[PDB]
Design a protein around this motif. Structure first.
Motif, short mmCIF file in Angstrom:
data_model
loop_
_atom_site.label_atom_id
_atom_site.label_comp_id
_atom_site.label_asym_id
_atom_site.label_seq_id
_atom_site.Cartn_x
_atom_site.Cartn_y
_atom_site.Cartn_z
N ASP A 186 0.82 -1.21 0.00
CA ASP A 186 0.00 0.00 0.00
C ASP A 186 0.85 1.26 0.00
O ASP A 186 0.63 2.16 -0.80
N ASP A 187 1.84 1.31 0.89
CA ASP A 187 2.71 2.47 0.99
C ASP A 187 3.62 2.66 -0.21
O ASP A 187 3.87 3.78 -0.65
N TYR A 188 4.13 1.55 -0.74
CA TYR A 188 4.99 1.55 -1.91
C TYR A 188 4.20 2.04 -3.13
O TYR A 188 4.72 2.80 -3.96
N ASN A 189 2.94 1.62 -3.21
CA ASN A 189 2.08 2.01 -4.33
C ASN A 189 1.63 3.45 -4.22
O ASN A 189 2.03 4.29 -5.02
N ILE A 221 4.28 11.47 -1.32
CA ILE A 221 5.72 11.64 -1.06
C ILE A 221 6.40 10.40 -0.44
O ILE A 221 7.60 10.15 -0.66
N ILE A 222 5.63 9.62 0.31
CA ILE A 222 6.11 8.34 0.80
C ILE A 222 6.37 7.39 -0.37
O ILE A 222 7.51 7.15 -0.72
N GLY A 223 5.29 6.86 -0.96
CA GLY A 223 5.38 5.95 -2.09
C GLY A 223 6.46 6.30 -3.12
O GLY A 223 7.16 5.43 -3.65
N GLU A 224 6.58 7.59 -3.39
CA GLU A 224 7.61 8.11 -4.27
C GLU A 224 9.00 7.88 -3.72
O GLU A 224 9.94 7.62 -4.46
N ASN A 225 9.15 7.98 -2.40
CA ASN A 225 10.47 7.77 -1.82
C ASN A 225 10.76 6.31 -1.48
O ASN A 225 11.90 5.94 -1.22
#
Lengths: 166, 165
Positions: free
Chosen positions: A109-112, A116-120
């Motif tokens: 979920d976070d990776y997707n 700014i999280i998913g992007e990093n």
């Protein structure tokens, strides 16, 4: 089952920030937070806040070691916040005002996620599914024991040779 | 039956030559070492037994301390035996003997009250195969545990994570 971000990563949000004259937010280095997590047994390698045009976004990524001790540490990190009532599900309740850090281990979920999280997370790592990994490792192991037993099996045969001559 | 550790070979009936002074002499035995080497017997040393006449017409063949040694020596033994040149062959009062007779050193030779036995006790000790053969496969069945143990451990470490996951 569910996937995770390799190398293992921790997400923490709700970091307190401070707005300077120029309108940019700032915050602690997070090495302060690294130290705390170290004293807690969480043994992370790195804690870096996510930056943007404004500066500190109030969120940081916790970095753990590539190895299996890493995943261990991170999960602990995760279970801690979760049981403290400070998981993601807790961060997300519209139920009101939140106090202190909220934190959780990085999954798909976070990776997707389009933020700014998913992007990093994609800039720094890749999804991987536990069992798939957990499997290969006990296969790599059941594998050597054969090869050892094989080598012993051999020496045993070498020993029956002599007895057969004797 | 026991054997002499480090493993040794006995060969007898070496041809000797009597000099003016009444002492016998013979080949260095390094010539015999070489032959045995070419034969696959891979001995470390071949030394003839001497006395105050000099060459007694008998030599001790020395093999490596390890299990390859015992192997070599046994081959040496089985060769002479099948060639009709064992100890039992050396000892028949049945007449005149030609060429080397040889055999691996066991308790009889180590005990024996003669220049051989005297030179086997000066250089080695009796040991019983099975006793050795046992300890070695015990030393081995032992590590595999310890390895399996270490794996067994890593497996448990892996169920830990899964249980948390």
């Amino acid at each position: 089952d569910e996937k995770l971000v390799y190398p293992w990563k921790g997400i923490v949000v709700n970091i307190p920030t401070t707005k300077a004259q120029d309108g940019r937010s700032a915050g602690e280095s997070g090495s302060k937070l690294r130290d705390e997590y170290i004293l807690r047994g969480f043994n992370p390698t790195r804690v870096r806040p996510l930056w943007n045009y404004l500066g500190h976004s109030g969120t940081a990524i916790v970095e753990f070691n590539k190895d299996w001790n890493g995943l261990h540490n991170g999960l602990l990190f995760d279970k801690a916040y979760t049981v403290d009532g400070h998981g993601k599900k807790d961060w997300l309740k519209k139920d009101g005002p939140k106090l202190g850090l909220y934190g959780w281990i990085a999954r798909a979920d976070d990776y997707n996620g389009n933020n700014i999280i998913g992007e990093n997370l994609r800039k720094t790592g890749d999804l991987k599914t536990i069992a798939e990994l957990t499997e290969e490792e006990a296969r790599k192991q059941e594998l050597l024991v054969q090869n050892l037993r094989q080598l012993v099996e051999e020496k045993k045969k070498d020993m029956k040779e002599i007895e057969e001559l004797c």
